[PDB]
Amino acid sequence: GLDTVSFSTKGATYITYVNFLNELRVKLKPEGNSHGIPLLRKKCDDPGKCFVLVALSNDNGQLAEIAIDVTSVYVVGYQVRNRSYFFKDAPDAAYEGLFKNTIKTRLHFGGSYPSLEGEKAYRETTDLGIEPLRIGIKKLDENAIDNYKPTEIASSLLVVIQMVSEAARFTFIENQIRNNFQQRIRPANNTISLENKWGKLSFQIRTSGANGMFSEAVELERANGKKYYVTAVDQVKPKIALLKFVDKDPK
Numbered sequence: 001g002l003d004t005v006s007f008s009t010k011g012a013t014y015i016t017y018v019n020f021l022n023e024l025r026v027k028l029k030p031e032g033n034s035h036g037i038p039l040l041r042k043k044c045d046d047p048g049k050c051f052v053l054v055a056l057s058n059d060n061g062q063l064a065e066i067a068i069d070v071t072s073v074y075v076v077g078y079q080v081r082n083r084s085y086f087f088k089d090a091p092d093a094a095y096e097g098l099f100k101n102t103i104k105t106r107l108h109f110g111g112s113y114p115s116l117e118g119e120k121a122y123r124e125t126t127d128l129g130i131e132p133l134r135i136g137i138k139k140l141d142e143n144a145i146d147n148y149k150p151t152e153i154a155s156s157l158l159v160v161i162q163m164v165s166e167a168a169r170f171t172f173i174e175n176q177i178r179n180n181f182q183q184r185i186r187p188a189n190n191t192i193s194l195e196n197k198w199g200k201l202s203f204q205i206r207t208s209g210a211n212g213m214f215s216e217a218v219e220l221e222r223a224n225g226k227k228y229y230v231t232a233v234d235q236v237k238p239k240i241a242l243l244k245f246v247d248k249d250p251k
């Protein structure tokens with residue numbers, strides 16, 4: 001009994017992409033907010049209503065259905081044809097509860113960025129855009145076999161994770177893609193540092209008082225790599241679409 005959201009690359013435009021992200025943001029059903037920013041649910045154990053299925057299909061009709069966690073917006077696994085694949089670190093409840101009636105497989109790598117790098121998929125060298133998305137979908141479908149190529153699945157999921165999960169979390173990433181939609185771009189140091197700091201930013205924002213002052217500054221980077229520190233909500237609020245509910249200071 002999960003919510004579902006679709007995104008087709010056929011005839012896709014920067015507008016269909018943005019509308020898709022906002023539909024996803026709604027279906028993740030955040031509860032409450034912190035300083036006006038929607039706050040994702042803290043806990044949601046039941047696999048039967050704690051995942052949103054994103055149906056990604058390309059011009060050729062190839063389909064990949066991605067399961068996205070409603071508390072973290074992270075990809076835990078996906079279904080292609082009559083097969084399903086899960087990251088090595090997907091919890092047991094999710095592995096058993098999702099994509100029933102499929103031939104199930106647990107991947108030999110995790111979904112974290114450093115785990116994906118282990119499979120040769122690096123954010124710095126992975127193109128993002130509508131074409132990279134079409135190719136990623138294609139590759140996930142092509143690898144719906146026993147002897148699948150982990151490097152292809154890893155790079156394809158890296159594209160999906162950033163264009164869906166990270167873009168849904170950050171209006172900044174959403175817009176880097178929105179105005180480069182028909183092109184191929186690779187995230188710079190600013191995008192990468194934002195992605196890396198979603199949990200820390202979420203914690204400092206949620207635990208701040210009415211003045212929005214962070215108890216501890218969060219380090220981010222400009223495109224060129226120059227470091228800067230976020231010390232207040234207002235400094236980063238226009239860049240965030242969803243906040244993770246973080247209990248204790250992450251690190």
Ligand SMILES: *[C@@H]1O[C@H](CO)[C@@H](O)[C@H](O)[C@H]1NC(C)=O
Nearest residue numbers: 124187188189190223224225
């Ligand atoms: C970060 O900035 C450096 C310049 O200091 C640049 O060479 C590098 O490519 C940047 N990294 C990314 C992924 O943008």
